[PDB]
Amino acid sequence: IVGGYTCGANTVPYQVSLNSGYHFCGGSLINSQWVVSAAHCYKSGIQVRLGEDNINVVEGNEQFISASKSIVHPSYNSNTLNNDIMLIKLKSAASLNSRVASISLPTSCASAGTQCLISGWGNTKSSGTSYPDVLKCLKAPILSDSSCKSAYPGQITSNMFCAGYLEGGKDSCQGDSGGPVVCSGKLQGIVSWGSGCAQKNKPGVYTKVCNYVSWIKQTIASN
Ligand SMILES: NC(=[NH2+])c1ccc2[nH]c(-c3ccccc3O)cc2c1
Numbered sequence: 001i002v003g004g005y006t007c008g009a010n011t012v013p014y015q016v017s018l019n020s021g022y023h024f025c026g027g028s029l030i031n032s033q034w035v036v037s038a039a040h041c042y043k044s045g046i047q048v049r050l051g052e053d054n055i056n057v058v059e060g061n062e063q064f065i066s067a068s069k070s071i072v073h074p075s076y077n078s079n080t081l082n083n084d085i086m087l088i089k090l091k092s093a094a095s096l097n098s099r100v101a102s103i104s105l106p107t108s109c110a111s112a113g114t115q116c117l118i119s120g121w122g123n124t125k126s127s128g129t130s131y132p133d134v135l136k137c138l139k140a141p142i143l144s145d146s147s148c149k150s151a152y153p154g155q156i157t158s159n160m161f162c163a164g165y166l167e168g169g170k171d172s173c174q175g176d177s178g179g180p181v182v183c184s185g186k187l188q189g190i191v192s193w194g195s196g197c198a199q200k201n202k203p204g205v206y207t208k209v210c211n212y213v214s215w216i217k218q219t220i221a222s223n
């Protein structure tokens, strides 16, 4: 997260860190046995870390659970990142409490101007790499589709939306991929891609979760 602030320990209880010996992507807990992340974060050997704040220190509240299976959306296109969503089923259910809690899926899509909270342990520099130990937060609005398509002509599909600041300075970045974009208590986006991080007129692009709720529900019901 570039230009964001320290969230404060466990203030984002649905945030998870996907780990394979180091933090490589974020994710969101939607129930006690399933996490939603981005399809481009897929790899084998994923350990899901819940209740984290400092990812390099065991401070208490952490629950480390192995992934039993990861389900990448069948129509995921790695060249356009269209349908960039993945579901991860946990080997055992997590113990939910006030520090580990799931986030609700939306019943309707959010409108331009909605203010959302984006969080993650991704790079904090737009020019260079500085990875934080604790979770960073950024409040950002969803932009209109015209401003999004004008920033990325020909690369925005109906399954994507832009959120951020066109003046630059505040954005999600590498390491934040797969993590949550929460607006009014509902998971509306997944950190997916962008051009550089926090560059002027190049806002972050996110997977539009309201278009996948029936798919997430049907897939969880059958696995
Ligand atoms: N500017 C943004 N809003 C943004 C968000 C997530 C990102 N993830 C990545 C990324 C870069 C290299 C490898 C994996 C990634 O997810 C870039 C990147 C940029």
Ligand SMILES: [Ca+2]
Pocket (backbone or CB within 6 Å): 052, 053, 054, 055, 056, 057, 058, 059, 062
């Ligand atoms: Ca920790």
Ligand SMILES: [Cl-]
Pocket (backbone or CB within 6 Å): 149, 152, 153, 154, 155
């Ligand atoms: Cl276009």
